[PDB]
Design a binder for this molecule. Structure first.
Ligand SMILES: CCCCCCCCCCCCCCCCCC(=O)O[C@@H](COC(=O)CCCCCCCCCCCCCCC)COP(=O)(O)OC[C@H](O)CO
Ligand SMILES: CCCCCCCCCCC[C@H](O)CC(=O)SCCNC(=O)CCNC(=O)[C@H](O)C(C)(C)COP(=O)(O)O
Ligand SMILES: CCCCCCCCCCCCCC(=O)O
Lengths: 172, 122, 459, 81, 86, 71, 12, 128, 127, 61
């Protein structure tokens, strides 16, 4: 929603520090420049005027934007990273297993039997999730992208199937 | 070489332009300059399948080089003395070229300083 | 022929009186068998065209098309038999009746010896196709699409009929032989100019040429799959067969007049392939792709040089087998997702492994790698066009560069990507689909070994 | 096994460039919060990394010895002839 | 290599926090909420997850990072992301 | 599951090194120099420029055939 | 610790 | 220091230096507040069919179907002939066609006149 | 702030469900149940032959796999190519053409039996 | 980029009538340049798919 100032300045600190990583390289240089970066942030912390805080932000964002490394270091398991969605091409959805031939179905009786238990569990709890939603919808439709939990016992969290049964990040 | 600076930055008249040199008759001023010859006759020169750019006067210093290289196989570390002979002979016809290059260079100011010499007093 | 036409006609009462459920079986049996018989005509003698009767004859151009059409007939049967299995027996029997009848006209048209007989059946193919696109179509724009296809073809064909009978009254007989041996110089004159325009426009519309082509994106996309092949795989080449025969008399006026058609095809083929670079319907993607390939055939005919005619037939046959394949590919997805939008079903190699492989060679054949027959056709035209004019290699190659982007574009968008989350009805591909796809690509790669059979009447 | 993590009380700033960083920070009036984090990146076996040129002549300590015995064989062969 | 397991993560978790000089070693309960007892500044937790971000070779998005405030939470989020299921 | 890991992971510590990799590295890092000086000794002329380049200025007009300025 | 490999059915 | 980052149609201006987030009024917060709500209604609905076991079909996106309509059929009925469209039709249409016609015709006239006199020689060119 | 108490419970139940679901993704020791196939006679001959594992079995095992590899990947392919390039193509002219063997003055030619006249004297251009 | 710099050099040879020397450059470049890639591959795989030249160091021993 509305990103308040104290969050946005934290985003600057996190991202700017990661950018000087691509600049400082050496660890000892990092720890020195980080401390100067850290304390130079804390020196101005008593601004009762919130307008002045944005005015301080009025030069920081441009300071970041021209001091940013043109090839910033991002970890590979992330957007821009070298290993972003590298192993995605094996994330076969679990519902595809229902189309397996019985010979292959009988190849793994234990996992398939447990898959039936999960499918039966999902079938029973689906309608339980459904009425849970309209029991606590905000007046005027769902206000927030968030999702309420399971309030009572014996109830799975609403809209849990895809999150719980999502493929592993390292499927191979 | 260093003549390039004296040709572009300096007056290009004094320096030759390798595209068209020689210009004046090389035999002019040369008392009985000795005519080049090559021992390697053409049909055997063509027999050796010898590349056109390698068909200079000293090209006969290849025919033994290939011969030893052919016969001494598999020994490739051999065939060094005659190979050095060809390179040394490549030295000789090459040094011949800056002799005529210098001669063209030296006859350049020769003619030119003459041109204003026999014309300024008149 | 009688030896192919009669078995083709005799399939009509066979399918009608066949068993209740054995209709698809038996029709597939003998249609494959009839194709085997038609393999006999692939042989041609030295120079004289293979002549059987007064009304029927074959050459080194008709026979490569004849085998293509009869080989196609089994393919439409299996492809269409998926959804057709959910209606009345008479309705399904009526369809097989109509494909058999449609194929019957194509076989008789390609071997027609009299130009009037050629025109009668050439236009007669409209009726079986028109009902296919309209009655059994699966959209709403088919109603307008059928009218667009019928009226465009007819509006060009009618001047041909007036022009054709004019040759009959003036020159005499219109046999494809007597026309050739009695060719007279068609001198430049305004009456001859419109004579040239009338005898050419009819075949140009069915190519289609850039501008007279808007019926194709409507007809091909809305048509059922049993049709969606033939409107792209055989009867576009039927317009091609008309050009290569009718241009026997249109010399030397063709070179003076060809300029508007060459520029329209040579420049429009860049624009048409540019449509494929940004499209939303997979069927429309292949449809506009066909226009670019046919536009290359359009320019190819008009130089009227030995190399161009060979590359004309080579691309003409290869594209038909290719464009038929891609329509099978789009059919498989369109059945599973029940939509034609490209981005809706992104990710198929993850779920269907061999479907990606068939898609790979399908998109590769359109990409026209050497020595694929598509490449052996396009390359020949480029050399022929370059000899005509050196500048055309800028336009000719630009399509070759452009055609790579879109031909691999549906490969990336559909196959190479994350599978769409919401879709859950994708099934393991039926062995019918894979068997059909092999029936398309195996002859194509096998044909690579001996291009002499399909190289045309000038080898 | 378990993959036992190393001890905690052997990774401080001594003998590392970090302590030099620490005194510079203390000179301007600052406290380093992550001084002991790097520690292992300088201490332990990861210390005393060779210089650029020093790494270039890696194996020269034995390469020169190989020359001596090789040139000795050439001299012996030269004297033999 | 054996997968990064829950007991392995948490042992590596308080490895970093105790290695932080701003936190006293003794007060290191696995559920010690950063603001409540340790009382570190609101800038500080943003700078500690980066060490954790480098420790396990991952990224903790700002959307989730600002909520992550317990050593149990840090091991929770890392374990859930990299499919840790003992 | 099963073993088969000659090496073991290290946490913030120098990784375990075995014999085979060390002397294998030393051998080739040493024999590369062995090739360097051995070929240098036998063929220093290749890099030195065995054949000298004569100075153009020292070439006098006599063997250059340059008839003097008196003509 | 070996586990299942959810993959499309290639038997057909 | 370093003058600013002017944007472009291809290099857009980033949100980190945009004045919109650096000068906010309560009204702007009100409008952007329930942007999640309209997205949540779409998300909650989409999740409901997506997580529905009984749903054994594809979930149609009316925005996606609308896009295909907008790019395919809702174009000519919404087309209005104006000098801008009329000129662009001629400039992008008949224009280049005549341009290539002039270029090719001139080359053919150049080639045809040259081999008539005997300028180009194809002593080895036979196949064509 | 801070996980909200509702979202705290939300992630908690999702966490244990994820752990259990991934636990179900495991593989029991019996899995996979694989029906057997007819075994070629050479395989069963090996298994009773490699009951020791000593170099007695190791050298022959490696060399037999290499020996049969050479026969069915080097011997028989070059066999049919040799037949192809000795009787089939060779019956067609100008299909296999080489540059003439570059000979030198000196060594005689095998067929004419005449020593090629060697060159004359070089001007003692010794270093 | 080092490779593309190499092939730039090879065509420089071809420019002044040195085609075969380019082919000599082909073979010599082929040997060691191929080596450098899986030397990089060995370190990349060992360092859990890390390719950024910054998160490296201390690999000589
Ligand atoms: C839908 C619009 C048309 C689409 C494109 C069609 C093709 C373009 C050309 C249109 C004319 C086609 C009709 C051709 C008839 C036969 C042509 C032929 O063989 O040539 C004759 C020439 O043909 C003609 O003279 C007629 C064709 C020219 C165009 C005039 C009529 C057609 C245009 C109007 C009707 C069609 C347009 C649609 C109207 C709604 C030669 O006879 P001649 O003139 O030499 O006769 C002997 C003597 O010299 C005097 O007669
Ligand atoms: C070394 C090279 C660097 C290269 C890169 C350099 C990057 C830019 C450096 C310059 C940054 C600039 O001085 C500061 C700015 O961005 S904006 C003003 C900050 N002023 C406030 O935010 C007051 C309001 N206060 C709060 O928001 C909370 O108090 C807070 C979250 C701060 C702490 O939470 P608690 O604890 O109170
Ligand atoms: C100590 C200086 C060495 C030479 C440095 C410059 C090399 C390139 C320019 C000269 C090239 C060869 C001569 C020309 O002609």
């Amino acid at each position: 929603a509305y990103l308040t100032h104290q969050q946005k300045v934290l985003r600057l600190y996190k991202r700017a520090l990661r950018h000087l990583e691509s600049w400082c390289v050496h660890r000892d240089k990092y720890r020195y420049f980080a401390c100067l970066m850290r304390a130079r942030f804390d020196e101005h912390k008593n601004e009762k005027d919130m307008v002045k805080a944005t005015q301080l932000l009025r030069q920081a964002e441009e300071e970041f934007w021209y001091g940013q490394h043109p090839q910033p270091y991002i970890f590979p398991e992330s957007p821009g990273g070298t290993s972003y969605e590298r192993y995605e091409c094996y994330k076969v959805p679990e519902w595809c297993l229902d189309d397996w031939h019985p010979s292959e179905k009988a190849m793994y009786p234990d996992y398939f039997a447990k898959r039936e238990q999960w499918k039966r569990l999902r079938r029973e709890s689906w309608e339980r999730e459904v009425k849970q939603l309209q029991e606590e919808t905000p007046p005027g439709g769902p206000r927030t992208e968030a999702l309420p939990p399971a309030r009572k016992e014996g109830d799975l969290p609403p809209l849990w199937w895809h999150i719980v049964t999502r493929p592993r990040e390292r499927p191979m | 070489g260093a003549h390039l600076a004296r040709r572009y930055l300096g007056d290009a008249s004094k320096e030759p332009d390798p595209l068209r040199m020689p210009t004046f008759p090389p035999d002019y001023g040369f008392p009985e300059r000795k005519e080049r010859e090559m021992v390697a006759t053409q049909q055997e020169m063509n027999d050796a399948q010898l590349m056109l750019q390698q068909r200079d006067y000293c090209a006969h210093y290849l025919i033994q080089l290939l011969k030893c290289k052919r016969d001494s196989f598999p020994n490739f570390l051999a065939c060094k003395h005659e190979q050095h002979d060809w390179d040394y002979c490549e030295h000789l016809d090459y040094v011949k070229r800056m002799k005529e290059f210098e001669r063209e260079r030296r006859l350049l100011q020769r003619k030119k300083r003459r041109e204003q010499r026999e014309a300024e007093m008149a | 022929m009688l030896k192919i036409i009669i078995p083709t006609t005799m399939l009509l009462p066979m399918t009608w009186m066949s068993k209740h459920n054995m209709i698809w079986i038996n029709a597939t049996v003998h249609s494959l068998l009839i194709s085997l018989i038609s393999l006999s005509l692939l042989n041609q003698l030295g120079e004289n065209s293979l002549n059987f009767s007064l009304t029927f004859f074959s050459d080194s151009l008709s026979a490569p098309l004849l085998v293509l059409t009869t080989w196609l007939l089994p393919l439409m049967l299996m492809a269409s038999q998926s959804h057709l299995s959910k209606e009345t027996t008479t309705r399904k029997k009526l369809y097989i009746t109509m494909l058999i009848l449609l194929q019957l006209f194509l076989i008789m048209t390609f071997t027609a010896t009299e130009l009037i007989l050629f025109y009668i059946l050439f236009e007669a193919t409209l009726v079986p196709t028109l009902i296919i696109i309209t009655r059994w179509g699966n959209q709403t724009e088919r109603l307008n699409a059928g009218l667009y296809f019928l009226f465009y073809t007819l509006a060009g064909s009618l001047p041909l009929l007036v022009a054709l009978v004019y040759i009959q009254n003036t020159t005499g007989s219109l046999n494809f032989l007597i026309i050739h041996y009695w060719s007279h110089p068609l001198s430049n004159s305004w009456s001859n100019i419109f004579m040239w325009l009338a005898c050419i426009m009819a075949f140009m519309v069915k190519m289609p040429l850039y501008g007279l082509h808007l019926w194709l994106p409507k007809a091909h996309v809305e048509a059922p799959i049993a049709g969606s092949m033939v409107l792209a795989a055989v009867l576009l080449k039927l317009g091609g067969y008309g050009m290569m025969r009718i241009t026997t008399i249109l010399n030397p006026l063709t070179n003076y007049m060809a300029y508007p058609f060459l520029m329209l095809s040579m420049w429009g083929m860049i624009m048409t392939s540019s449509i494929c670079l940004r499209q939303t319907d997979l069927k429309s993607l292949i449809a506009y792709s066909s226009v670019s390939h046919m536009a290359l055939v359009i320019v190819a005919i008009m130089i009227q040089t030995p190399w161009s005619f060979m590359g004309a037939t080579a691309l003409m046959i290869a594209h038909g087998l290719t464009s038929s394949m891609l329509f099978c590919l789009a059919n498989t997805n369109y059945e599973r997702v029940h939509s034609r939008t490209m981005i809706l079903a992104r990710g198929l190699q993850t779920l269907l492994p061999l479907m990606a492989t068939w898609w790979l060679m399908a998109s590769l054949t359109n990409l026209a790698l050497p020595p694929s027959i598509n490449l052996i056709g396009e390359l020949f035209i480029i050399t022929a066009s370059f000899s005509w004019s050196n500048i055309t290699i800028i336009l000719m190659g630009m399509n070759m560069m452009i055609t790579a982007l879109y031909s691999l574009y549906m490969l990336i968008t559909t196959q190479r990507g994350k599978y769409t989350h919401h879709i859950n009805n994708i099934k393991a591909s039926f062995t019918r689909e894979n068997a059909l796809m092999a029936l398309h690509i195996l002859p194509l790669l096998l044909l690579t070994l001996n291009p002499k059979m399909i190289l045309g009447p000038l080898y | 096994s378990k993959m036992e993590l190393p001890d905690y009380k052997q990774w401080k700033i001594e003998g590392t460039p970090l302590e030099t960083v620490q005194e510079k920070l203390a000179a301007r009036g600052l406290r380093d919060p992550w001084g002991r984090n790097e520690a292992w990146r300088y201490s332990g076996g990861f210390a005393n990394n060779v210089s650029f040129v020093g790494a270039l002549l890696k194996g020269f300590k034995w390469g020169f010895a190989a020359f001596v015995v090789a040139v000795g064989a050439e001299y012996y062969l030269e004297s033999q002839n | 290599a054996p997968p990064l397991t829950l007991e392995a993560i948490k042992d590596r978790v308080l490895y970093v926090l105790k290695l932080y000089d701003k936190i006293d070693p003794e007060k290191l309960s696995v559920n010690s909420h950063f603001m409540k007892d340790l009382g570190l500044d609101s800038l500080d937790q943003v700078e500690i997850i980066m060490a954790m971000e480098d420790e396990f070779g991952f990224e903790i998005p700002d959307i989730d990072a600002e909520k992550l405030m317990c050593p149990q939470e840090i091991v929770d989020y890392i374990a859930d992301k990299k499919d840790v299921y003992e | 599951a099963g073993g088969g890991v000659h090496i073991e992971p290290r946490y913030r510590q120098f990784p375990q090194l075995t014999r085979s990799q060390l002397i294998q590295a030393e051998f080739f890092s040493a024999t590369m120099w062995f090739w360097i000086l051995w070929r240098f000794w036998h063929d220093s002329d290749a890099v030195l420029g065995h054949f000298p380049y004569p100075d153009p200025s020292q070439w006098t007009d006599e063997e250059l055939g340059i008839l003097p300025d008196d003509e | 610790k070996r586990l299942f490999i959810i993959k499309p059915s290639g038997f057909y | 220091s370093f003058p600013k980052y002017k944007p472009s149609r291809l290099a857009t201006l980033p949100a980190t230096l945009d004045p919109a987030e650096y000068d906010i009024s309560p009204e702007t917060r009100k409008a952007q507040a329930e942007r999640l709500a309209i997205r949540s209604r779409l998300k909650r609905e989409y999740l409901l069919q997506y997580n529905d076991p009984n749903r054994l079909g594809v979930i149609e996106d009316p925005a996606l179907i609308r896009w295909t309509y907008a790019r395919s059929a809702n174009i000519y009925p919404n087309f209005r002939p104006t000098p801008k469209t009329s000129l662009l039709g001629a400039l992008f249409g008949i224009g280049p066609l005549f341009f290539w016609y002039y270029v090719f015709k001139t080359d053919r006239d150049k080639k045809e006149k040259l081999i008539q006199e005997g300028k180009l020689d194809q002593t080895f060119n036979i196949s064509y | 702030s801070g996980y909200t108490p509702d979202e705290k419970l939300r992630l908690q139940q999702l966490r244990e469900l994820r752990r259990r679901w991934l636990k179900d993704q495991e593989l029991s020791p019996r899995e996979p149940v694989l029906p057997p196939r007819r075994v070629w006679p050479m395989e069963q001959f090996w298994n009773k032959f490699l009951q020791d594992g000593a170099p007695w079995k190791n050298v022959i095992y490696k060399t037999y796999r290499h020996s049969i590899f050479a026969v069915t990947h080097v011997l028989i392919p070059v066999w049919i190519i040799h037949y192809y390039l000795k009787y089939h193509v060779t019956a067609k002219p100008y299909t296999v053409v080489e540059r003439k063997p570059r000979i030198f003055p000196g060594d005689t030619i095998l067929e004419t039996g005449e020593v090629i006249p060697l060159m004359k004297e070089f001007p003692d251009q010794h270093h | 980029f080092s490779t593309s710099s190499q092939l730039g050099l090879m065509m420089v040879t071809i420019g002044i009538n040195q085609p075969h020397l380019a082919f000599l450059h082909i073979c010599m470049h082929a040997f060691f340049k191929a080596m450098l890639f899986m030397c990089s591959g060995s370190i990349i795989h060992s360092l859990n798919d890390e390719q950024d030249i910054r998160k490296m160091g201390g690999l000589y021993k």
